[PDB]
Ligand binder design. Sequence first.
Ligand SMILES: [Mg+2]
Ligand SMILES: [Mg+2]
Ligand SMILES: [Mg+2]
Ligand SMILES: [Mg+2]
Ligand SMILES: [Mg+2]
Ligand SMILES: [Mg+2]
Ligand SMILES: [Mg+2]
Ligand SMILES: [Mg+2]
Ligand SMILES: [Mg+2]
Ligand SMILES: [Mg+2]
Ligand SMILES: [Mg+2]
Ligand SMILES: [Mg+2]
Ligand SMILES: [Mg+2]
Ligand SMILES: [Mg+2]
Ligand SMILES: [Mg+2]
Ligand SMILES: [Mg+2]
Ligand SMILES: [Mg+2]
Ligand SMILES: [Mg+2]
Ligand SMILES: [Mg+2]
Ligand SMILES: [Mg+2]
Ligand SMILES: [Mg+2]
Ligand SMILES: [Mg+2]
Ligand SMILES: [Mg+2]
Ligand SMILES: [Mg+2]
Ligand SMILES: [Mg+2]
Ligand SMILES: [Mg+2]
Ligand SMILES: [Mg+2]
Ligand SMILES: [Mg+2]
Ligand SMILES: [Mg+2]
Ligand SMILES: [Mg+2]
Ligand SMILES: [Mg+2]
Ligand SMILES: [Mg+2]
Ligand SMILES: [Mg+2]
Ligand SMILES: [Mg+2]
Ligand SMILES: [Mg+2]
Ligand SMILES: [Mg+2]
Ligand SMILES: [Mg+2]
Ligand SMILES: [Mg+2]
Lengths: 79, 64, 50, 96
Amino acid sequence: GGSTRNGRDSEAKRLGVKRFGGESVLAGSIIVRQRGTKFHAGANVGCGRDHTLFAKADGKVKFEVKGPKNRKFISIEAE
Amino acid sequence: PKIKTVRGAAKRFKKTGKGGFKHKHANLRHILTKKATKRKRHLRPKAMVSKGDLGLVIACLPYA
Amino acid sequence: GIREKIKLVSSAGTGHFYTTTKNKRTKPEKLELKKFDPVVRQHVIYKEAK
Amino acid sequence: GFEGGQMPLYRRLPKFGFTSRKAAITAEIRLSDLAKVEGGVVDLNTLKAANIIGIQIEFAKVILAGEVTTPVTVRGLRVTKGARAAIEAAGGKIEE
RNA sequence: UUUUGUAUAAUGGGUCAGCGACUUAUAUUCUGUAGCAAGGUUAACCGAAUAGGGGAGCCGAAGGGAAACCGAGUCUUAACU
RNA sequence: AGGACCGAACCGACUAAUGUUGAAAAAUUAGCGGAUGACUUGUGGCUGGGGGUGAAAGGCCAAUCAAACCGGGAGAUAGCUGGUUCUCCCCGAAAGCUAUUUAGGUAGCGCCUCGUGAAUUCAUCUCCGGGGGUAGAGCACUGUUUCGGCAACAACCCGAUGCAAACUGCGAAUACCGGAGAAUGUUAUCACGGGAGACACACGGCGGGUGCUAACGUCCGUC
RNA sequence: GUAACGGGGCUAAACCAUGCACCGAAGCUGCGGCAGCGACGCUUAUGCGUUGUUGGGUAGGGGAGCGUUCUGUAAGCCUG
RNA sequence: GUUUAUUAAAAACACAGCACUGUGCAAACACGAAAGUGGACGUAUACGGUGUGACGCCUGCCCGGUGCCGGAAGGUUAAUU
RNA sequence: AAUUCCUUGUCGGGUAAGUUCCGACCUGCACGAAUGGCGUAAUGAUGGCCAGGCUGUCUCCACCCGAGACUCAGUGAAAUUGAACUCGCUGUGAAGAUGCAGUGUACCCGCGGCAAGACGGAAAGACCCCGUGAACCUUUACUAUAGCUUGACACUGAACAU
RNA sequence: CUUUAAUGUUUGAUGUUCUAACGUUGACCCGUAAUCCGGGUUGCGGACAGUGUCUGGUGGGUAGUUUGACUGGGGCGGUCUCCUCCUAAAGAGUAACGGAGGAGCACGAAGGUUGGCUAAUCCUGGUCGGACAUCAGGAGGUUAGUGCAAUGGCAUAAGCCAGCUUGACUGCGAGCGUGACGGCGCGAGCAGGUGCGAAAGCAGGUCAUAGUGAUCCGGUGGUUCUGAAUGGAAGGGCCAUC
Ligand SMILES: [Mg+2]
Ligand SMILES: [Mg+2]
Ligand SMILES: [Mg+2]
Ligand SMILES: [Mg+2]
Ligand SMILES: [Mg+2]
Ligand SMILES: [Mg+2]
Ligand SMILES: [Mg+2]
Ligand SMILES: [Mg+2]
Ligand SMILES: [Mg+2]
Ligand SMILES: [Mg+2]
Ligand SMILES: [Mg+2]
Ligand SMILES: [Mg+2]
Ligand SMILES: [Mg+2]
Ligand SMILES: [Mg+2]
Ligand SMILES: [Mg+2]
Ligand SMILES: [Mg+2]
Ligand SMILES: [Mg+2]
Ligand SMILES: [Mg+2]
Ligand SMILES: [Mg+2]
Ligand SMILES: [Mg+2]
Ligand SMILES: [Mg+2]
Ligand SMILES: [Mg+2]
Ligand SMILES: [Mg+2]
Ligand SMILES: [Mg+2]
Ligand SMILES: [Mg+2]
Ligand SMILES: [Mg+2]
Ligand SMILES: [Mg+2]
Ligand SMILES: [Mg+2]
Ligand SMILES: [Mg+2]
Ligand SMILES: [Mg+2]
Ligand SMILES: [Mg+2]
Ligand SMILES: [Mg+2]
Ligand SMILES: [Mg+2]
Ligand SMILES: [Mg+2]
Ligand SMILES: [Mg+2]
Ligand SMILES: [Mg+2]
Ligand SMILES: [Mg+2]
Ligand SMILES: [Mg+2]
């Protein structure tokens, strides 16, 4: 055998889908590792150490797709 | 007979303005060389129990 | 482990100090490299590192 | 406190000690009191005999609780600039 | 009764009559109820004994800080942010 | 003479049967060994319990022995098993997560009950806004396969053909999150506090790991 | 020991398609009655009429009661 | 010869015989906080402990490990000062 | 072999036929020299094997004599027991049915007798596991200690030499 | 009075002797027409032995106990915390003694910033150059490279080179994610001070996700917080830290 073990939660995922109330600085999209699974853009960015899509100034969320060969990109428009 | 308070707990909790108990944070008196200076900074200020363990301190500290 | 622990004392008379590690073997010389101790409220050199 | 087998909580959190040894004698008087001390001069004692402080007590603070009206003179007691205020107006004098 | 589940071939009782198991003391916290109310209430004791006297003392009207201390603020920090 | 020989008394127990609610809490019957000896027996005395005594079996020490009997500490402790007694009315679980010298125990949370507060809270449906890589499919990639081909048997490459939980240049149903709106629902919703029980679940449908796409098998998700 | 439709027995009392009728539950309805909650019609210790709805239940929570022995009310009241 | 009184009488225990080892007597050893007593009114041809078990022929090699006996030079080492 | 797993080893003897027995071999799974090795007359309610004699041990049971059992009179128990109007088969079912479904057979009740079932009676399974259970036992488990030992200071003093 | 010998002291030792504590289970006397006991004489011994307190050793002779859980019964074996992928049904989350691998670190630069740079592979040509070192050209396009697993990600590179450097700063922190909890994580922005850039600006450690241990009891440094009559101090608190 010699097989088993396994990591834990590490949740990681979108916690602010579509236009949301978007607090002054909600989470939005954790999904660590992800530098490109979701990209920083607009009135939100940050992209913390663990690539956590920050989310600056409060407001609706966008979720787009632009230049550099598709690319996700998360931005937040004000309500 | 007057209930005996859990001497120990009475040295880690301090009843606040209301129910709240106010307590000290763990991980700030051992192996710190390899710890985030931000982690410790966000550890110095002591700050109360969680209502889920609260009912486990007001039964430990009868005369609080 | 091997990576011994190290303390960086302030060059200033102040007693404040910093803490980190270093490979006592590979690098013989002791680490010196400045920092900022709240006391003097100013940046300054930091010595001592085996 | 027995939280199953796992280490308790009153055993998981550190302990911050050190106790007064001076607060037990350091009392806290209130505006409501003051003139309630029967007559003038709110002395170090008097309050004690006025069943409002307690023997052992050695020190005490004036502090604002509300009342004051009647002009009074506190003797040998501490007071806040927010209490020494609400008193001199309604008439009064601080020891010192 | 115990079980996911018993007509169970799982437990217990041959039957009847009597007896047989959440009490009691103190402390503490809620709810209900009554008294009084920023006040409430005495303990031991005296006793004219369930009265009345006794307010020693306890709880509450102030909290924050490890504390010194400050006080409707106060710790944190050089800091009013 | 002899721990000598045969054999009663006497001492003992090798075999068998009968007895097994016995005549008997170990005997009766027919046999059996020893029978001047380390023999056997009467009376009385001495060794005391973690102690005695023992030609040694843990054997005996009053039908009791891997630590006697009696009284006391004593209502030891029992996370174990059992039991728990009159009546009507309302609501109504769980067999789960996490930690545990924990696993048939317990604690926090989840779920029940009671009370106090609070708002278009909450729910279904229609519409609008989202992320999706599962089903299926595909084969550029990562591997894996066939048949041709150009190639000192066969690499790459081209064409044609399949396969994949840990392949994806594609990609649903739908579940989930949010916004709007009507209607219906005895605020179903949230928070604080009094009281809990419960952490052995079983089968059946659907998606699966394990097993033999065996089991009234086993382990998850979901109704 | 028939025992591989429950049985009898069935050539349709099997099977397929279409259609009507009937049987069938503590479901739904009808009638009489009970209690928790809501509304309205009257009525205002309110308490009723109608009327809407709810009332399977272990662990367990909540709310109502009955009866037994004893003390006061008991020199009362019942009793040869 | 002895033994599991009450499922085991035996190859088990014992035994004469053998050996190792202790003991100089106020013996070793043992019962006993102690006094004292047993050993023994014996005294190494005696007494204890341990293993083997008439007798016959015999009883090989290994001292590294553990124990026991001897040694003291050195290393380390308690209370104490 | 009281030691041998393979194993009924192989060979010889005994028998009509021998996983046992006796004699050998040696490949001793894993004998061996006083937790003695190999022998041994005698002894043994000791283990194994063989033969004569003997027989109801058996082929294969028959008859007979007595004590019960059976009938009568007297006295007079027991365990067990939720309640009984207590049948068979096939199936169902907490998975092995007198009690459920279907069906079959059967007038009511004793007495002698036999034990297939009532998972019959009997002991809160001793096996197995479980309990942060117990007890005795062992040791280079831990931690302690009686005893046995070491030194120091006391009780404990005086002289001379180095 | 500083370096060095004889006398006397005091003092340890070693070694002889003595007697006078102490031993006598040698003899004799007396209490006593007693083997006990006591006293006396004598002999032998003698500061020894022996006992008390303290102390090192030995100490199953004796005593109290411990000697884990999961587990397709138990045991044997294996496992026990953390990280990666799948199982996991397109949000999160999930089981098995399911299928596979990793961590218990490394780095004063491998951190920060600024300026610049861009691979593998093959084809052809070129001294020694060999299948494959280095040079040229072409093709090619994340097939390379990320300090170490796997997954996601990376050209505006998070890959590579170099200059100057210490932001691997200190006090805080709107608002979030994730937990039963202890707790862990992300974070713009504020204050004080830094580094690099001309500047906008970036920097509170490394592409991210493992690389860890609560509490207690103490150790070290700082501080006028406390300091049991007062002043101090010991101890305690607070901050840093082992
Ligand atoms: Mg008073
Ligand atoms: Mg069962
Ligand atoms: Mg039954
Ligand atoms: Mg009864
Ligand atoms: Mg004889
Ligand atoms: Mg006989
Ligand atoms: Mg004889
Ligand atoms: Mg006798
Ligand atoms: Mg007996
Ligand atoms: Mg007791
Ligand atoms: Mg009891
Ligand atoms: Mg533990
Ligand atoms: Mg598919
Ligand atoms: Mg899903
Ligand atoms: Mg459990
Ligand atoms: Mg379970
Ligand atoms: Mg389940
Ligand atoms: Mg099942
Ligand atoms: Mg009809
Ligand atoms: Mg009907
Ligand atoms: Mg009901
Ligand atoms: Mg004999
Ligand atoms: Mg016997
Ligand atoms: Mg016998
Ligand atoms: Mg022997
Ligand atoms: Mg022998
Ligand atoms: Mg033979
Ligand atoms: Mg042998
Ligand atoms: Mg020998
Ligand atoms: Mg049957
Ligand atoms: Mg019979
Ligand atoms: Mg039985
Ligand atoms: Mg049992
Ligand atoms: Mg022991
Ligand atoms: Mg004990
Ligand atoms: Mg276990
Ligand atoms: Mg998911
Ligand atoms: Mg990395």
